Design an enzyme around this catalytic site. Structure first.
Site, PDB file in Angstrom:
ATOM      1  CE  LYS A 147      -5.183  -6.524  -3.917  1.00 39.02           C
ATOM      2  NZ  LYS A 147      -6.046  -5.573  -3.092  1.00 39.02           N
ATOM      3  CG  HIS A 185      -2.029  -1.017   1.050  1.00 41.90           C
ATOM      4  ND1 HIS A 185      -3.033  -0.943   0.117  1.00 41.90           N
ATOM      5  CD2 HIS A 185      -2.209  -2.183   1.712  1.00 41.90           C
ATOM      6  CE1 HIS A 185      -3.809  -2.005   0.230  1.00 41.90           C
ATOM      7  NE2 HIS A 185      -3.313  -2.792   1.170  1.00 41.90           N
ATOM      8  CG  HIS A 196      -4.984  -5.545   7.733  1.00 39.87           C
ATOM      9  ND1 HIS A 196      -4.693  -6.523   6.814  1.00 39.87           N
ATOM     10  CD2 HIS A 196      -4.903  -6.123   8.953  1.00 39.87           C
ATOM     11  CE1 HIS A 196      -4.401  -7.635   7.448  1.00 39.87           C
ATOM     12  NE2 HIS A 196      -4.517  -7.415   8.742  1.00 39.87           N
TER      13      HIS A 196
END
EC number: 3.1.27.-
Length: 104
Positions: A31, A10, A97
């Protein structure tokens, strides 16, 4: 799952993410989407300073975001650039996350 993986997944050192390259690797495996943050790591890590138990946090400042959004052709993407807050899961003083853009 941890700060090292969060950085890989990220954080980008370029705004113009080469989505069709990076999204094709095992980490992302073609994805539909992935949000990248254009920053060196420390100001991103700092979002979670002081936060010990896992907790979702919305950034206080906006950041430069680069999103790889799949097109109608599998594993081929359009890059969208925006400036926004984002929500991360903070754990033991580091992001672990990515939750979402704009809101937890």
């Amino acid at each position: 799952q941890d700060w090292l993986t969060f950085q890989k997944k990220h954080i980008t050192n370029t705004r113009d993410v080469d989505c069709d390259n990076i999204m094709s690797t095992n980490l992302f495996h073609c994805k539909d989407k992935n949000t990248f943050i254009y920053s060196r790591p420390e100001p991103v890590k700092a979002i979670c300073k002081g936060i010990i138990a896992s907790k979702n946090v919305l950034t206080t400042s906006e950041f430069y975001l680069s999103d790889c959004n799949v097109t109608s052709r599998p594993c081929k993407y359009k890059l969208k650039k925006s400036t926004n807050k984002f929500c991360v899961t903070c754990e033991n003083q580091a992001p672990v996350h990515f939750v979402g853009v704009g809101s937890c």
